[model samples]
Target: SWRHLVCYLCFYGFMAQIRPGESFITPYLLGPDKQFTREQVTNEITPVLSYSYLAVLVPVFLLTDYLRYTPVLLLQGLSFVSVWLLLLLGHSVAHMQLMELFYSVTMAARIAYSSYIFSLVRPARYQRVAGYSRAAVLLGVFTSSVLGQLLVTVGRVSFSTLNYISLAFLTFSVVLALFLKRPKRSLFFSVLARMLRELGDSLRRPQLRLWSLWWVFNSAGYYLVVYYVHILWNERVYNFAADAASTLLGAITSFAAGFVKIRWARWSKLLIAGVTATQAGLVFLLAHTRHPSSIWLCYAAFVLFRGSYQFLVPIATFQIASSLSKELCALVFGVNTFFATIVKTIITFIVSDVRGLGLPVRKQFQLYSVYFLILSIIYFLGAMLDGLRH
Candidate 1:
């Protein structure tokens, strides 16, 4: 029975993530069917995703816990469908903004899948199941990008056809969610208050506090870079190929992290600092370079950044979860991600929104380089303090 549930969950995860149209979305919007200008795609439509993600995340987090996992999973599937459907049918900037809103719902509702496996699996199996579910998602993304790239480049398929295929796969995921078993009980009222109290207590632990800080700040910057990197590339096929390459490398690094033995407690801070500094250099390179070969080299740097970050994520999750109950684990992660989204939203507003500075994509990346540099310095200082104390 446990095996069956794990299989179902993993399959659902795989299906939900296989959105072939995702990597080429920016190009599709700029293509003839939509004809949205570069400015409209970058400044106007994309910022809505960050803003809506922040606005919806808290409510979705609560609902995912209260209503149990399956309902929220189903909601995510429906929202995924809505996003593609709008992308296929809608032409105006407002329509794309609405699609971004639905995309945020899909993203915010993902806590359901992440937390759901823990509820169904035994405590001893949490690590195994988490690995399986995450691998499934990565595999799905890899497959999606490769398939999209092939269909576009080899088969000469239209972007709209890719969206149609993505829609079909997403609809199948909704059916999978319908068959998932809902947990018998869920946290509410006093239970939520207790979770909040425990969450506050957990943050006081230095290890958890440090990793949570990395998660909040680094994730904000990382996602912003990921969100806009496609615009930097002139060729759509390279966008898909880059995504596939990055996801593959990230998966390998994440898998390798499982077998590597190190005193992470001693080294994690310096490691994070070094990685962030490298990322800063990469983004700076991306900002300055325009030649195709140079741009691709910088993209490989971005891929390295992504891979190293993935390597640390499981470590962070384990450190955070090791001391908490299942409910508290969910709460802590949710709250951390909520704060990350808040930071991301503010950055999106100031950097990308027309109402604010409204910098072009190249300038936005330049600021992001500085952001990562500052982040690295903060971690370096923390690492120094730890060294002094020791």
Candidate 2:
């Protein structure tokens, strides 16, 4: 039964991340293809998506507990199906916004999948199962990324046809979700509310607060850079072939991140400080460099750090969960993710919305470079103060 459950999650994880790899092509298809009639309009979609995602995270989080994991997982699968169908059948700005609304639900459901393992598996097996689940997700991302690039570059597949492929994966996920057993227990209403309070209390600790802030801030910066990276590559390299290479880079680097073991309790702050500082420089290099080789090199460097961050965050999350009860874990995680999305939405407006700074695309990348540098300085200072206090 344990083996079966583990395989189910791995399969479902595979389905979940595969869509991201497919969706990576959206900027290229939507912006440069003139589907929106203006490239600037393309940038606005993310803020809309972020705001909607932020809105749904708390509700989806509550629903996962209220309904148990299976129902929420099924909803996620169906949400994916709906988003891809919209992407395939509709071309309007409203369609994309609606797709993002569904996408937010999918994102919230993913949190449940990770935490769902704890309820289904032995505590001794938690590390192994969690590792397998994460590996499955990254592997799915890597494989689909390769396949998407190949079909587009070599087989001459249209971007719309790509949604058909994503639709197939989501459909499979729904089938898998149907087979998943319910958790033996879920949080009672009072327990869920208490968990939320405990999550807030955890943040009152200065170290934990900074740790959470690091994740939230970097998440926004990361999305700003990565979601537009293909567009940047297309501008500088002017070839889907070249842009596709970064997909390969992202795939390999993310897979590589899984093996990196960090002793987060001891050095999480220091490492985050160092990486934030380094990553800021990488983004600057990406923005300012003109030569094709140099740009790709910086891209590779940026992705290397960005990919490693996936591994880094799990360590922090697990550390935070260490003190919480099994029933509270998912809700606690949801609270954290909820706050992160709120931050992401706010940051998105500043960079992407016309009512805000309304920076152009190139300028937006530069702004991201600056955002990370400022983040790096803040973390570095925090690290220094932490050291002095010790």
Candidate 3:
């Protein structure tokens, strides 16, 4: 099956190249090597990178659907390779900022990858194929995170060496790109007018509308934690070694999501309510904790939410996608991605600006903790309202 082959190969190619030590790249940049201030690293650099990435999503999304998946995948692979190369060769803030532009393209490509699977498999087989593919990506991430940590912890390899290793795997992915078949009938200008109508219709569904709300708030909270928590963890714990435990948590949780069966119609509301509340509480606790172990526990606990969010997101996404023709699935997801970008951009500005609430990084994280709590309440209320209408 070309579908299976593409999924496995793409999974392998992508997994091989991701740097396990990536979480520490920020810390290294903040160190004597880059000498960037903590404020520069956290507030200035991180948000700007995200902004640049979010800015191009809509255009890239349309281009991906129009051009088919291969070119974007190739660009994604190439962009990741470039990021490592820049990290290796340059030290200026300008160089790193430029890398963020490429990084945005890399992220947008990943968003396309999920939608691309529908292009390969029958709608009936989407759940199974997507599950297997998601597992493959998780396995790749888990393996890389562990490997990256092991090299630094036991072998004592430099972080630069990890980048070199990632660069090589990404190069292999570039080569793998040569073999990928474009999604069926997905060439440029394939279905212009009808796709727009399908998009408008998909957004109108009540379930999809709810999913969008979930996606936006969940993604905003998720990225804020992913980017900022390490700084929080590092601050609370003196001389914290690069363990890569956070990535491992993500890997394990993602792997589990592939197999875990949920009776979503019966359980989804309760699950979202419970999970979001727990997430909010964890952050609230995270903000107040002064003890190193307490901080680590809270951070790790917070990281686990990715697993639940992963489970909820795809269930909704697949439900929405399955309602449409395969040709239109990617386009719907493109619109969703565009909305997700807009949300992330808005949150980044509010949380990242010194003039805004994100100043003095720790305080900003505390605010995010509160933010998710509010989202949790809103999510539950939305579900209740939806339930009443039904």
Candidate 4:
């Protein structure tokens, strides 16, 4: 329990780092990394960085059965340190390439952390545990949005801005990782091996089958806005003052989402309905509005969208964790994410690169509107998943 408390604290601290980066990396990379736009950096340069995560996921997921959490924490902590260090000192194309390459292990660290955290908490208590876990994840977003705005405003916009900021978080993360307790390596690679071998052969699970539908439809709308917010801003060409206004709106919306979540005594089917309703309303309003002048509301609307819709994810994950054994928990979540990523990667490759594929750029929202229809249908099904009494 003592170790778990420490692990929890570390998770919160480390997540604070991930939150800002997730919300801002597109902007940061877009601002100029290797003198390329964020789109270029992510689409072309970062796949190499991102692939490392795919590689690390399989091995670490397999090994975690036996290795438990220590080595994973160490490797991930080291990777975090290494990536930031490269940012701090290396300016050339070659060095940035390396940073992008190694940073892929981010997915690995995240999944590994999820697995380890599940092992710490009891199975039946998973809902509350996972709720707080997801809350911590979002709280990091809240922290990063605020901190990132402060840093960019007060600090320089050069590479050093990112370097020192990331390093500060990584530094604290490493200190926490160093103290995580030693776990007996018991299960070994059989779990991961079995998961891979059985993946296709195993019939689609009822719960997983249901959730996959939810993931695709919802994410279609969700990611369109989140990923393209910067592109949307680029159209506005906001000055520093305008940029601060947008970011401040983002911070306010994020904190408001957290406050709303904490007030809900139970995240039930009603919560899902409320979230879906709010999401559709927000998107409809976003679609109707063409004002680049009132950009802060546009920004606020965007934040409000992410804030409301995250309700389903944490609740669903915790519910799943409740039904599994400890060894199965990691493997289950890993398999779930693995499947989720396969579809998402394909979509990301296509949707994200649409400009190259000759899709009209101005039609991005129109295209996303189609995704909205799909998401609505998906939400209809998520309602079914919840209503299924069998």
TM-score of every candidate: 0.83, 0.79, 0.81, 0.74
Candidate 2 Cα outliers beyond 4 Å, as residue runs: 20-51, 85-100, 122-130, 156-162, 186-192, 204-210, 234-262, 351-363
> How does candidate 2 score on lDDT?
0.67
Q: Which candidate ranks first by TM-score, i.e. highest? A: 1
Q: Give the candidate number with the greatest lDDT.
A: 1
Query: How would you order the candidates by lDDT, starting with the best?
Result: 1, 2, 3, 4
Please identify which of the two predictions, 1 or 2, would achieve the higher lDDT against the true structure: 1
lDDT of 1 by residue, 21-110 (tens): 887799999999999999999999988996788688887766676677789889989998899989989988999999999998988887
User: What local lDDT does model 2 show for residue 203?
Assistant: 67
Count backbone overlaps in model 2.
Answer: 0
Clash count list over all predictions: 0, 0, 0, 4
Between candidates 2 and 3, which one is better according to TM-score?
Answer: 3
Q: Candidate 3: misplaced stretches above 4 Å?
A: 2-10, 13-17, 20-48, 89-97, 186-194, 236-243, 260-267, 357-363
For residue 145, model 4's alpha carbon misses the true position, in angstroms, by: 3.9
Arranged by TM-score with the best first, the candidates are 1, 3, 2, 4
Error (Å) of candidate 2 at residue 226 is: 1.3
Assess the local accuracy of residue 102 in candidate 1 as a C-alpha lDDT between 0 and 100.
94
Q: On residues 109-226, what C-alpha lDDT tens digit does candidate 2 reach at each position?
A: 7778766755667664554555566667766766676677676667776676666777887788788888888986544447556656866776666555665676578866776677
For candidate 3, lDDT tens digit of each residue in 358-381?
A: 565677677878888888888788
Candidate 4 residue-wise lDDT, 98-209, digit = tens: 7766677655656556656566665655555555556565556456655665566665555456556667777777776777666555453455456565443332454444
